[PDB]
């Protein structure tokens, strides 16, 4: 119910930005409401969770040299945690992404900042 | 002891039975609480229900209906964690608003019963006295 493929341009090699994606304590600022654990490690090209709270599903986070820097690619594919057909028909979707876009944009602009 | 704690009360000036009924519809559960999913423990009639919450919270809630007046206190008690959480995000949450959001949604399901009960006679319908 919830799909993103969103991608961002990093200036920095694939070890920091890993790092950066890699913070326990960053996953909790940047998805308050998901609890994420971790399915494979992938070392310096990123991270695959399966999410519970908020959200069931997968997230992964995948890093590929381009230009100067990386692109880190964020992936989402998950529903709305136990909701039932009643309540799922009240959700307006399309918001719900966007809101889970700007949170994927904000996770790469800290990621960015702080690594250039 | 729960993060969510209420108990409040309403005076409906409707029969216990009109009362009851109200609150026990499933349909209006889901205008009321969109967010949770009630089961039934009990249903007490014209005193009320008991039931489980799941979804964005896990526990208990109550109506209890004590006569007064020319109707009855509608109690309105809900005790309730937020489902599943880790303590890291219970610890980062503002329980006191958390309440407060709960307790103004609890007494809008009181006062719409109310208004709906207590409502006069509609206009130009029988009977016209």
């Known amino acids: 119910s919830i799909q993103i493929a969103d991608e961002t341009y990093v200036a920095a090699d694939a070890a920091r930005v890993s790092a950066a994606v890699a913070d326990r304590c960053s996953w909790r600022r940047w998805w308050p409401d998901l609890r994420l654990q971790v399915t494979e490690d992938r070392a310096d090209k990123g991270i695959r969770w399966t999410v519970t709270g908020a959200l ?32 799922l028909a009240r959700m307006n979707l399309a918001r719900m992404t966007h809101h889970r876009r700007v949170a994927g944009k904000k996770m790469a602009f800290e990621v960015k900042t702080v690594l250039e």
């Not at 995948?62 to 057909?85: K, R």
């Open 56 to 87: 069931t599903g997968t997230m992964e986070i995948w890093l590929e040299p381009s230009m100067d820097g990386v692109l880190l690619h964020y992936f989402l594919h998950a529903e709305p945690t136990g909701v039932a057909a009643w309540q």
